[PDB]
Amino acid sequence: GSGEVNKIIGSRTAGEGAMEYLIEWKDGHSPSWVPSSYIAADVVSEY
Numbered sequence: 166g167s168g169e170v171n172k173i174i175g176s177r178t179a180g181e182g183a184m185e186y187l188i189e190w191k192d193g194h195s196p197s198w199v200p201s202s203y204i205a206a207d208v209v210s211e212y
Contacts, residue, residue: 168196176200182209 174187178198186198194212197203202211 168192182207 169188169192171188171191174185174189176185176187178184178186178200183199183204185200185202188196190196190202192203194203195205197205199205199212200210204210204212206212
């Protein structure tokens with residue numbers, strides 16, 4: 166459902182840790198609104 170697809174990507178979070186959103190990350194860690202990755206758990210640029 167609009168995730169892990171690897172198509173159009175919107176990306177705007179914060180910068181302190183996250184700052185992106187859409188796929189472009191082969192669903193490394195659960196598709197997420199995060200920075201060129203998926204850092205859902207207090208983290209930056211990854212998980």
